[PDB]
Every structure is written in structure tokens, then in C-alpha cells.
From a paper:
The Rho-family GTPase Rac1 activates the WAVE regulatory complex (WRC) to drive Arp2/3 complex-mediated actin polymerization in many essential processes. The WASP-family member WAVE exists exclusively in a 400-kDa, hetero-pentameric assembly named the WAVE Regulatory Complex (WRC). The studied complex is composed of a trimer formed by WAVE1, Abi2, and HSPC300, and a dimer formed by Sra1 and Nap1 subunits. Rac1 binds to WRC at two distinct sites—the A and D sites.
Using cryo-EM we determined structures of both WRCD-Rac1 and WRCAD-Rac1, as well as WRCapo (WRC without tethered Rac1) to ~3 Å resolutions. The overall structures of WRC in these three complexes were similar to the previous crystal structure (WRCxtal), with a root-mean-square deviation (r.m.s.d.) of 0.83–1.22 Å. 187-230, which was not included in the previous WRCxtal construct, did not show any density in the cryo-EM reconstructions, suggesting that this region is disordered in WRC. By contrast, in WRCAD-Rac1, the density for the W and C helices and part of the meander region were not observed in the reconstructed map, suggesting that upon Rac1 binding to the A site, these sequences were destabilized and released from the WRC. Consistent with these observations, the pyrene-actin polymerization assay showed both WRCapo and WRCD-Rac1 were autoinhibited and could be activated by the addition of free Rac1 (blue curves), whereas WRCAD-Rac1 was basally active (solid blue curve).
Residue numbers in the entry:
A (entry chain B): 822 to 981, 988 to 1121
B (entry chain E): 3 to 106
C (entry chain A): 5 to 26, 57 to 337, 341 to 367, 380 to 539, 542 to 574, 578 to 784
D (entry chain C): 24 to 177, 499 to 518, 528 to 543
Write the structure that this text describes.
């Protein structure tokens, strides 16, 4: 029994009161304090990725061979560690999202004219502009509380060879993709409608993947759409593979882990439902939702 | 630029589709009767092969062009509406400024 | 001007960006064809008879013999009803000639000398199809008491005007009157005309044995075929048990197996005869000639496994297991991959058929067994019979389970139809490969044996099978082949060609019947000469080639395996009302029953399933337009959809707004207050979560050829509600 | 029969299928184009209105702006549009190909001609097929259920506001729509 109630500090009303007290300066300070921890966790994740690079590089290329892919997965190390770290990152990003929503609601209500100008400016920036200007625009908007596709605080925090770093980012996406079905075996992965999510917080992975992909592949000048598309292909393939199993222990929570693909595609501003349909039939998700909501 | 499409591209392609419909309906009967009353059946046969290949290619080409024209038309309209939304938002902001000035 | 250009056009057309979207055999063949034509004509008459609505219920009646306008209503009625009576005359002539033809075939086939030769299994199945056609036609004519009244009214009107003068005309009219007046006329004629034939029961025993065999081995794909087997079994048993024949003596000789048929009927007790007119299968046993003294033999006459909620665990398991594997398969390929796609297509079709069968069987059993006011506490005393067959006959769980199963059927159907090109290519390639491998490689050994032997009947047949279905990649059969001569192989590799094209229906049928001829118990036997492995491999190929015809037409069979059109039609129960009703209320319609149950209970789990229960209307309307082929049926379906969809939109919008208003109110409530209230046993309960997101994103719902933007209508209603809320607050 | 005859017949058949496909594609494209054209008309009208409104708004005078305190309520309030779509499955809405396949289906018997002789003065065909029957039955059920439920249940600105409340009281609010029937039923149920 913790000596406090978490809902009496993170409620919508409480977060709005905190925004009233703190203002944009205090909220920016809070966000920076959170991105520090995210950067720490990402450093650890990069360590784990580099200590697996050979097997990961092979898995990135042999996703068409179920037997060879299973053989490769057998040799990976520290998988539950990767999942735990990404869950922590997702939890921190969820807290940030709550705080940003509170701040936006307060600001749009105290200073409507500045907020209207800011929103008009952000919405209609030419999509052909480069990263330098868009970063300043997004930084202003985020200070105002609006939500942005690419978080500028995270982009700044994750910058503290370059081609080696790009390769490491791609293999981090691969690692996290292929490790998902390990969550079915866990017993705390139950999806609860009273929670609208899982007991052990694996529903924040949507935040984790989307935000981390955006940040890294803006830092290393990639293509966020393509990288997230590859991640979706791999994750869908892995979960489809676990689909045919029959063990009553390694598939205790197949439906709950299936719902994560839907959560990820919903959160992402780069992934649409057409891609998910092409790679993962939606009837499976419909049946999973029926099963959990029983 | 949108008028060039609306007035004559899409309607022209639709009329072309109707013409192809009629021509193919006639060519089917022509090929059948030609084979029936042909001295050499083999020659009639590869001729029918040629007509069917030509018909398939032409229909595919026409459908492709119509689809492209419709796609471009929709995209242009979406761009217009985005621009007009921006202008309307500006007008709303101006009206709000005026009302606040009057109140002050 | 070439395949390359056309194919390139198609390819470039299939890549545009489309987002935001989510001898002794020829005579047999000829007779078989004629019999099939008679079958289709009989189906036409059956549909004519099912959708017959009384036209004499609208003709004004005459009270006094001096009604001022009596002649000129008689002229009206004769002109109205002349073509309907033409239809009935044609029906009578058809049934008479059909019985003549069937009995002629049965007589020819049973001839003492000819009872030795074989008859292809396909011919036996077609004979079963006639016996079933006669059964359905007789029962239809029995139910429909409106045709009698229509003909009587026409006859009175026509005689009052002296419209008929000829002697032949009066004789034909009075023959039609006899036909319509009687009861079980068609079956009685069939019996009286069969029994004159000596030893007719042996052919029927053959039919029933074949049907029992097929049903046991699961040699069917569509639910229609599965039920046809049982109907043929039952009606064949009924016919066989006449005066000159006794099925219990015939069973004592181990000629038929009554225990197997009894077990089958016990497991499955009702099947849809036509439309919504069911047939209880034990009714054939009950009414047989010698049933009473042998009543103890059957246990299918008493009365369990129709609780659809029991099969749902298995249905869900199979759904997920199959779709997970199918989703993996979404350049030239090896034969193994094409064979896998063939297996997967067949397996998906079988699963779809099985699910459709579950749903329809439950529906039929429910229809034949209406509830009462003691069984169901909520059933009102003044409940119509149809209202008691459908509306009050289902529990909540049963309705939810039916919706689940229908949704699974429709989802898997769209998935399977999406892969129609890959399945077509894979299926054709596998069929061609299997047929050519068999013909060219497997038939070399038996042909060599037969050449090394005096017997030449086998040689003629095997050689005939080779001419029929061999595609010699060099155009001619190899000449230095030693197997053809007789000498042993030294070897002699032959390269079998590959290509994606299936055998025409005629030649596939010929090949299958000739193979059946070789491995035949009766033919002095052709199977005696053959060796062991030869017959074993022939039996194999003959068994797998059963489904080739079905699979080559993948789209049609996929359509057939997922047919749920009959849940709407109610002509039978409408006829039983004796004119009291012209149609039933929507709250008695099955699709609306299911959809409205989901809407009213506000079930969270089932909220994603509603649109499939609505979709049922599409299948029903398409069926009415294309098969029944009647305008007024589509008019009625359209009116029903018009009313029910507006009701659906209203209810959905109302409950959506209520749900989100409650969530908004609950989010902002003080948390410490909730804690305190719970600590004193006065909990302010949370609102149950629910799944409305999928519905709010719908923008091209499809109903009866219209595209409906659900989002727009929900927005209109919700905005009205928001304005009302603000006004109420102020 | 020679096989080449069958192959040629099949080739003619596929050409006929190509022609049918052409007609169906034309139908789809026309259905798209018509509504796109309607959108274009609406967009042009809205653009004209926006241009007018912008030139009008640029010349608003705040210092000269005068507000009538006395006329606060006697002014007519602005009301947003309340259009709500219904009857989406009327016969008018039928697509063209579905109508084509509907018109080849068998028509009901010409049972209307009996109408002039009927004493009841009802249509002849309404005894053969009544699509309006469902609606009538539903309405009747709704009406009696509602009645049964009801039975079972049982300064100068000061002048301006006074006039406003008087108008609101006197100018109160003032059917064959399903939504209205359901609303009345539920309202009586409360």
C-alpha cells in the first residue's frame, strides 16, 4: 500500500492545476527533466543492441524463412530487458502527454489570441520546408502545449561514426519488433477493459515505438514512414507466427498482445490502417477485442 | 486548370468508354460470324486472337486514363479547400480582434 | 497488338495509389445432360410455386345474383388470372412428363441382363437429385392452398362467361382441377408408376448406399450438397418401403444399413427443404408403409446438440488457427508452394461451409420447434406462430453467438475472395500437374502389364484415358517407349510439362468415369486383372479428383459456401396465416432481431459486429433479385431496410452521445470524493468501457447498392444533442 | 465437335465481357464525376462568399461601432442549420445498374384494374404486396405504446429582457418521421 494515491496527482484536474501553477516555463523544465531519463534508457538500449549486432543483422534479412528466423531468435540475448526498457520509455512519454494536454487546455483558455496565432502558424507551415525551420516552429508549438509529430525535446535530448549510428537505430527497431510475442507468455499482460490497457503497462509501447522512431530517424536523416513500415511488417509476421501455436503457457495472452498492433497503428501519425490490413488481417483484432471484452 | 479537367477530360473519357462498349459489342458478333463463314478456320482464329488482344489493351488504357484524371481532380479540390480554410481562419481571427477591441 | 502490351497495360493499371480505403460413355454423358436440364426446369417451377401469392384475395366478391356489375368483374378476373392458370397447366404437364422420364430411366437401368454392368457414381447422384426434386415439389404443392382457390375462382369466372367451348379445353380444365384438388399427388403417382417395374428397389438401394457412403466420408463441399445427401437418403427409404418391397427384409440381407441412416438422422434432425419450408427427416420414417410394426428399430424418432453456444470454443479456435496461417501468404514458384495454396484454398472453403451449415441447421431446427408461454416466461399468450418460431425462440446468448458466427463467415469470405487470383493460378497449376503426372507417368505400368497380357479391355480403356487427357509436350506420344511395347523399362525419363490451365469439364468427367470403371466391384471383372498398387493408386487419384470441379470455380463455390439469404424469406409462414397478414412486422424479422438485440443491450464486445447483421440484407436482396427473380420481394426488402436503418442510426447516435457525456462527467469528478464514497459503501460506479471507435470511422457502408456515410449522420445527431445540452444548461 | 469452334466462341464471349466491363466502368466513373462536379459548384459559391466577407470585414469601424442596449432581445437570434438526412433507401436513390437488373425481373399481376369495382375503395394491389405495411404497423405500435405508458405513469435593458422572456414564452415550439416518433416515445418514458 503506497502511502499516496497516484490518481489524486495525475488526474486531469490535478494536471490542470499544476499547469496553472507552473506555466510554460515550469512545464518546459518538467519536460526536460523527463527527456533526460528517456535519453538514459535509450543509451542502455543501444548497448543491448550493439551486443547482438550479428544475429540482429541476419534477422533483418531472413524474415521470409520461419525455421531460420526461429533459429536466429533462439540465439538472441537480453530480450525481456529490451522490453522492460521500452516500457519504461513509454510510461515516461505517457506522463509527458498528460502534462502537455493539461497545459494546452490552460493556455488556450488564458491567452486565446496568442494561442490562435500559434495554432494557425503551426498548422499551415509548408510541408516542403526543411528541418531547421520546422524545429523552431515545433519548439514554439510544444512550448504552447500543442502535440507535434516530432517531439523537439526528445530530438534535442537524444543528441546528447554516423552511419554506424544509423545502422544501430535500424537494428533497434528490428530487435523490438521481433521480441513482441515474448509478452504472450507473461501473465500480467492481460488486457483489462476497466483499464483500457494491460496491467503491466505494455500499452505504452505504442508511444515508445512511435516517438523513438521519429526522434532517431530525424536525428540520423532517415525516413520515418519507411522505418515504421518495416517495423510493422516484422512485428505482424512474428505475431502471426505465434498465431498457430497450441501451448497453453506461451500463448496465455495472445489476444492482449495482438491488441498492441492496433494500439501502435492508432497512435502513430505515420502508420495508417491500410498498411495494417495489408500485413495483419483485422478480423483477428476484432476477435481479440471480443475475447478480452467478454 | 480544373476546368480543363471537369469540362472536357472526364466527360471525353466517359464518351470514349461508351464508344468502346458499342464497338466491342459489334466486334464480338463480327468475329463470330467471320469464323463461321471463313474459308480457312485457322486464319480466322488468330484474327480473333488479335481482336481480343487489341480490345483488352484499349480498354485497359482508357480505364487507366479516366482513373488518373479523377485522381488529379480530387487532389486539386482538396488543395482549394485547404487554401480556403486558411483564409476563413484569418477572417475569423480578424473578427475576433475587432470584437475584443470594441469591448475594450 | 500482342499479349505483352495488353499485360503491361494491365500491370501499369494495377499500381495506382489508392489510400484512405480502410464408346459406352458418350451415351451416358448425353443422358446425364438431359437429366440435368430437367432438374433446372424443375427448380424453375419450384420457385414459381414458392412465391405464389393469392390473387383471388383482391378480386371483389359478388353477393346478389343481380349485382349491378357482375359480368364486368368476371371479365376482369378472367383477364387477370389467365396467365397464372397457364403457369399451372405448364406445371402439371412438366411433372407428368418428368415422372414418365425418371421411371423410364429406372426401368431401363434395372433390366435383369443389364443389372451386371456398372453405372458411374455421378449418374446415381443425379438420380438422387430427381428423387429430391419430386419430394420438394410435392411438399410445396401441398403447403400452398392459395393455388387451389385461385384456380377455382378462375374456373367459376370462365364458365360464367362461356369462355371455354371446346371438349378438349373442358377436359384439360377438369384434369387440372383433379391435380390441384388431391393431396400428395406427385408422390402417389411416382409410387404407383415405380412399383410396376420388377426389382426397382435394387437401384434405390444403390442410390441410398452411395449417399450413405458419401456422407460418411465427407465427400461434399457446400451445405446444399450435405443436406441433399440426407434428403435423398430419407426419400429413397420412403419409396423403397412400398407394397412389393420391404426395407427391413432388404436390411436383414445386409443390402442397406438402417443403423447408419438412423444415427445420421438422430444427429441431424431437420434440413431446409426450400426457402423457409423445412423438412423433418424422421417424418419419412414415421410415414413409411411398415413403420408401425417395426417402430422399435429406430431411435431417431424420439428426442439436444443444437445449443449453438456449445460450438463457439471450437469455432473460435479454428477461425484463429486458419486465418493466422492464411495471412502469411499475402516470379515463378515451385510445385510445393502451389500445392500448399491448393490445400489452403480447399481447407478454407471447407471451414466456411461448416460454419454456414451450423448456422442454418440451428435456424431450421428452431423454425420447426416454436416455443410456448411456459418455456419462455416472456412469450405473450397472443403470440403469432412465426413470432413464436423466431422472436421468442432465442436466448440472449444464442443471438450473440449467431451474430459472432455470421460475422466470422463474412470476414473469412472477404479474406478468401481477396486472394482469388493467387488461388486461381495455384489451383489450375496443381490440377494440371496432378492430371498430367497421373496420365503420363502413373498409367505406364498398368498399360505395360496389360500389353504383356491377352486381356485387351483394360488396354482399350487405359489407352482411351491417355488420348483424352494427354498433352504431349512434343505433340506426339514417345515412340521408343518400351512400356508401350511390353518390355520392361531399362527408366525412360519423360519430362512432364507445366502450365496453369484446367481440364475442360467434359474430359475431366470422362476420365473420372473411366477410372471408376476400372476399379469397379461389378463390370469377368476389370479390377481382377489389375495388380495391387495399381488399384491403390487409381483409388487414390479418383478420390482426390473429386473436388477439382468445385475448386476450379473458386469464386462461385466461395459464394455458395457462405449463403445466408434464407434468414429473411417467410412465404411459408405467410401462407399459413390464411390471409390475416400481408407481411410480418420488422420486430419479427431475423436480421433486425439480431441487430436490435445488440443495439438495445449496448453490448461492448458485440458492438463491432452490428454491421454484419445489417449486411444480411445484402445477401437476401441479391438472392431475391437474381434467383427468385421477383420485383415485389425486392420492394419489400427495400422498404424494410429503409425503416430499420433509420431506427439503427437514431439509436446508435443516441447511445454514443450518452456514452461520451458520461465519460466526460466521470473524468472530471473529484477522485478523493470517489474514494470517500467507496469507503462508505456508496460507490459512484464507473461507466463500462465500450467499442464505438470502429463505427465512428465508417464512411462507405454498403446497403442495396447505396453507399452510406455513417460518420455524417452520427455527426448530425450528435451536434443536435450538444446544442440541446448547452441550451438546457443555460 | 471441332475444338477450334469452341475456342472461337469463348473468345467472342470474353470480348462481350470486355464490352460489359466497359459499360460498368463508365457507370462508376460517371457516378464519381457527378458528385465531384457538385462539390465544385459548392466550392465556387463558398469562394465568392468568402471574398465578399473578407472585403466587408476589412472595413469594420470600431470607434463608430454603436450597440443598441434597448434592442438586446427584440433582435432575432441566429440559428445554425439543422438539416438531418432520412429515408436514404427511397426508390429514387437506386443506382443505375441495380435498376437495370431490377427492371428485367417479373412484375406483379396487373391486379390494379380491379380497383374501380371495389366497394371498400382500397387499391387492388395493396392486397397482394404492401411495402408501406411495415411502416404503418410500426407507427401504430409506437402510438399505442406511448399512450399506454402515459396512462400508466399517471432600467431599459430590464424592459428588453422582459420583452425577450415574454416572446420566448409565447413563441414556443410548434408526424411520419421515425426519429420524431422515437423521441416522443422516450420523452413520455421520462
Amino acid at each position: 500500500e503506497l502511502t499516496f494515491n497516484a490518481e489524486e496527482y495525475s488526474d486531469i484536474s490535478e494536471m490542470r492545476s499544476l499547469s496553472e501553477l507552473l506555466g510554460p516555463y515550469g512545464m518546459k523544465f518538467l519536460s526536460e527533466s523527463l527527456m533526460w531519463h528517456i535519453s538514459s534508457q535509450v543509451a542502455e538500449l543501444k548497448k543491448l543492441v550493439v551486443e547482438n549486432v550479428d544475429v540482429l543483422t541476419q534477422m533483418r534479412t531472413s524474415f521470409d524463412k520461419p525455421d531460420q528466423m526461429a533459429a536466429l531468435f533462439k540465439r538472441l540475448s537480453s530480450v525481456d530487458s529490451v522490453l522492460k526498457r521500452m516500457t519504461i520509455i513509454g510510461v515516461i512519454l505517457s506522463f509527458r502527454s498528460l502534462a502537455q494536454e493539461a497545459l494546452r487546455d490552460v493556455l488556450s483558455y488564458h491567452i486565446p489570441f496568442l494561442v490562435s496565432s500559434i495554432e494557425d502558424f503551426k498548422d499551415h507551415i509548408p510541408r516542403e520546408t526543411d528541418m531547421k525551420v520546422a524545429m523552431n516552429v515545433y519548439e514554439l508549438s510544444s512550448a504552447a502545449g500543442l502535440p507535434c509529430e516530432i517531439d523537439p525535446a526528445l530530438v534535442v535530448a537524444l543528441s546528447s561514426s554516423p552511419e554506424e549510428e544509423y545502422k544501430i537505430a535500424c537494428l533497434l527497431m528490428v530487435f523490438v519488433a521481433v521480441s513482441l510475442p515474448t509478452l504472450a507468455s507473461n501473465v500480467m499482460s492481460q488486457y483489462s477493459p476497466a483499464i483500457e490497457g494491460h496491467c503491466n503497462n505494455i500499452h505504452c509501447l505504442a508511444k515508445a515505438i512511435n516517438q523513438i522512431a521519429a526522434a532517431l530517424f530525424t536525428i540520423h536523416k532517415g525516413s520515418i514512414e519507411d522505418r515504421l513500415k518495416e517495423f510493422l511488417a516484422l512485428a505482424s509476421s512474428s505475431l502471426l507466427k505465434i498465431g498457430q501455436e497450441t501451448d497453453k503457457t506461451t500463448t496465455r495472452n495472445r489476444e492482449s498482445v495482438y491488441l498492441l498492433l492496433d494500439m501502435i497503428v492508432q497512435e502513430s501519425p505515420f502508420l495508417t490502417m491500410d498498411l495494417l490490413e495489408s500485413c495483419f488481417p483485422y478480423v483477428l483484432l476484432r476477435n481479440a477485442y471480443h475475447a478480452v471484452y467478454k | 486548370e480544373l476546368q480543363m479537367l471537369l469540362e472536357e477530360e472526364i466527360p471525353g473519357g466517359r464518351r470514349a468508354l461508351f464508344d468502346s462498349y458499342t464497338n466491342l459489342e459489334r466486334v464480338a458478333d463480327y468475329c463470330e460470324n467471320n469464323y463461321i463463314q471463313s474459308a480457312d478456320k485457322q486464319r480466322a482464329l488468330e484474327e480473333t486472337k488479335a481482336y481480343t488482344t487489341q480490345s483488352l489493351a484499349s480498354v485497359a488504357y482508357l480505364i487507366n486514363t479516366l482513373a488518373n484524371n479523377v485522381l488529379q481532380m480530387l487532389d486539386i479540390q482538396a488543395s482549394q479547400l485547404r487554401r480556403m480554410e486558411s483564409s476563413i481562419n484569418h477572417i475569423s481571427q480578424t473578427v475576433d480582434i475587432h470584437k475584443e477591441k470594441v469591448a475594450r | 497488338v500482342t499479349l505483352e502490351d495488353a499485360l503491361s497495360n494491365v500491370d501499369l493499371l494495377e499500381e495506382l495509389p489508392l489510400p484512405d480505403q480502410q464408346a459406352r460413355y458418350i451415351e451416358q454423358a448425353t443422358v446425364h445432360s438431359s437429366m440435368n436440364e430437367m432438374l433446372e426446369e424443375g427448380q424453375e417451377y419450384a420457385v414459381m410455386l414458392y412465391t405464389w401469392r393469392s390473387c383471388s384475395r383482391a378480386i371483389p366478391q359478388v353477393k346478389c345474383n343481380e349485382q349491378p356489375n357482375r359480368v364486368e368483374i368476371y371479365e376482369k378476373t378472367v383477364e387477370v388470372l389467365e396467365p397464372e392458370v397457364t403457369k399451372l397447366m405448364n406445371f402439371m404437364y412438366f411433372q407428368r412428363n418428368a415422372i414418365e422420364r425418371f421411371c423410364g430411366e429406372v426401368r431401363r437401368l434395372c433390366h435383369a441382363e443389364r443389372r451386371k454392368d456398372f453405372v458411374s457414381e455421378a449418374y446415381l447422384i443425379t438420380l438422387g437429385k430427381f428423387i429430391n426434386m419430386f419430394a420438394v415439389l410435392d411438399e410445396l404443392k401441398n403447403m400452398k392452398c392459395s393455388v387451389k382457390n385461385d384456380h377455382s375462382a378462375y374456373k367459376r369466372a370462365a364458365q360464367f362467361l362461356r369462355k371455354m367451348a371446346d371438349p378438349q379445353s373442358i377436359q384439360e380444365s377438369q384434369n387440372l382441377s383433379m391435380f390441384l384438388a388431391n393431396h400428395n399427388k406427385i408422390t402417389q403417382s411416382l409410387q404407383q408408376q415405380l412399383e410396376v417395374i420388377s426389382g426397382y428397389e435394387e437401384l434405390l438401394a444403390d442410390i441410398v448406399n452411395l449417399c450413405v457412403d458419401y456422407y460418411e466420408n465427407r465427400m461434399y463441399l457446400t451445405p446444399s450438397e450435405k443436406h441433399m445427401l440426407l434428403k435423398v437418403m430419407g426419400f429413397g427409404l420412403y419409396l423403397m418401403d412400398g407394397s412389393v418391397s420391404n426395407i427391413y427384409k432388404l436390411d436383414a440381407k445386409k443390402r442397406i444399413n438402417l443403423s447408419k441412416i438412423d444415427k445420421y438422422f438422430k444427429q441431424l434432425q431437420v434440413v431446409p427443404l426450400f426457402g423457409d419450408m423445412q423438412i423433418e427427416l424422421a417424418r419419412y420414417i414415421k410415414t413409411s408403409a411398415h413403420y408401425e410394426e417395426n417402430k422399435s428399430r429406430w431411435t431417431c424418432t424420439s428426442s439436444p446438440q443444437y445449443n449453438i453456444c456449445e460450438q463457439m470454443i471450437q469455432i473460435r479456435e479454428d477461425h484463429m488457427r486458419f486465418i493466422s496461417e492464411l495471412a502469411r501468404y499475402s516470379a515463378q514458384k515451385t510445385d510445393a508452394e502451389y500445392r500448399k495454396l491448393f490445400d489452403l484454398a480447399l481447407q478454407g472453403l471447407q471451414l466456411l461451409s461448416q460454419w454456414s451449415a451450423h448456422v442454418m441447421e440451428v435456424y431450421s431446427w428452431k423454425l420447426v420447434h416454436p416455443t410456448d408461454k411456459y418455456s419462455n416466461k416472456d412469450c405473450p399468450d397472443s403470440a403469432e406462430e412465426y413470432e413464436r418460431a423466431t422472436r421468442y425462440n432465442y436466448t440472449s446468448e444464442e443471438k450473440f453467438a449467431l451474430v459472432e458466427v455470421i460475422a466470422m463467415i463474412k470476414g473469412l469470405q472477404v479474406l478468401m475472395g481477396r486472394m482469388e487470383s493467387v488461388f486461381n493460378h495455384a489451383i489450375r497449376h496443381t490440377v494440371y500437374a496432378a492430371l498430367q503426372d497421373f496420365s503420363q507417368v502413373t498409367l505406364r505400368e498398368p498399360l505395360r502389364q496389360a500389353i504383356k497380357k491377352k486381356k485387351n479391355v483394360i488396354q482399350s480403356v487405359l489407352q482411351a484415358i491417355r488420348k483424352t487427357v494427354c498433352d504431349w509436350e512434343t505433340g506426339h506420344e514417345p515412340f521408343n517407349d518400351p512400356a508401350l511395347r511390353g518390355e520392361k523399362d531399362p527408366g525412360f525419363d519423360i519430362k512432364v510439362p507445366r502450365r496453369a490451365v484446367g481440364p475442360s469439364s467434359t474430359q475431366l468427367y470422362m476420365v473420372r468415369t473411366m477410372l471408376e470403371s476400372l476399379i469397379a466391384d461389378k463390370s469377368k471383372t476389370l479390377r481382377s486383372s489389375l495388380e495391387g498398387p495399381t488399384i491403390l493408386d487409381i483409388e487414390k487419384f479418383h478420390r482426390e479428383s473429386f473436388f477439382y470441379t468445385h475448386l476450379i470455380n473458386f469464386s462461385e463455390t466461395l459464394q455458395q459456401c457462405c449463403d445466408l439469404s434464407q434468414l429473411w424469406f417467410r412465404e411459408f409462414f405467410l401462407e399459413l396465416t390464411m390471409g390475416r397478414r400481408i407481411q410480418f412486422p420488422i420486430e419479427m424479422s431475423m436480421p433486425w432481431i439480431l441487430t436490435d438485440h445488440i443495439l438495445e443491450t449496448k453490448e461492448a464486445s458485440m458492438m463491432e459486429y452490428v454491421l454484419y447483421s445489417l449486411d444480411l440484407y445484402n445477401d437476401s436482396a441479391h438472392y431475391a433479385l437474381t434467383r427468385f427473380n421477383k420485383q415485389f420481394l425486392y420492394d419489400e426488402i427495400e422498404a424494410e431496410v429503409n425503416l430499420c436503418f433509420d431506427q439503427f442510426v437514431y439509436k446508435l447516435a443516441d447511445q454514443i452521445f450518452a456514452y461520451y457525456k458520461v465519460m466526460a462527467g466521470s473524468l472530471l469528478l473529484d477522485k478523493r470524493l470517489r474514494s470517500e464514497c467507496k469507503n462508505q459503501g456508496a460507490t459512484i460506479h464507473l461507466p463500462p468501457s465500450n467499442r464505438y471507435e470502429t463505427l465512428l470511422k465508417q464512411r462507405h457502408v454498403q446497403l442495396l447498392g447505396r453507399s452510406i456515410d455513417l460518420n455524417r449522420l452520427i455527426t448530425q445527431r450528435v451536434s443536435a444533442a450538444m446544442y440541446k445540452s448547452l441550451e438546457l444548461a443555460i | 465437335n471441332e475444338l477450334e469452334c469452341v475456342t472461337n466462341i469463348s473468345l467472342a464471349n470474353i470480348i462481350r465481357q470486355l464490352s460489359s466491363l466497359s459499360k460498368y466502368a463508365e457507370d462508376i466513373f460517371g457516378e464519381l464525376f457527378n458528385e465531384a462536379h457538385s462539390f465544385s459548384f459548392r466550392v465556387n459559391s463558398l469562394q465568392e462568399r468568402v471574398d465578399r466577407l473578407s472585403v466587408s470585414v476589412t472595413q469594420l469601424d470600431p470607434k463608430e461601432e454603436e450597440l443598441s442596449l434597448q434592442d438586446i432581445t427584440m433582435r432575432k437570434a441566429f440559428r445554425s442549420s439543422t438539416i438531418q438526412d432520412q429515408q436514404l433507401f427511397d426508390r429514387k436513390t437506386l443506382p443505375i445498374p441495380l435498376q437495370e437488373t431490377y427492371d428485367v425481373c417479373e412484375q406483379p399481376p396487373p391486379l390494379n384494374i380491379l380497383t374501380p369495382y371495389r366497394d371498400d375503395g382500397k387499391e387492388g394491389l395493396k392486397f397482394y404486396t404492401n411495402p408501406s405495411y411495415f411502416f404503418d404497423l410500426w407507427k401504430e405500435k409506437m402510438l399505442q405504446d406511448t399512450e399506454d405508458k402515459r396512462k400508466e405513469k399517471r432600467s431599459v435593458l430590464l424592459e428588453a429582457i422582459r420583452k425577450g422572456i415574454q416572446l420566448r414564452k409565447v413563441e414556443e415550439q410548434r408526424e411520419n418521421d421515425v426519429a420524431t416518433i422515437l423521441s416522443r416515445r422516450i420523452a413520455v418514458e421520462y
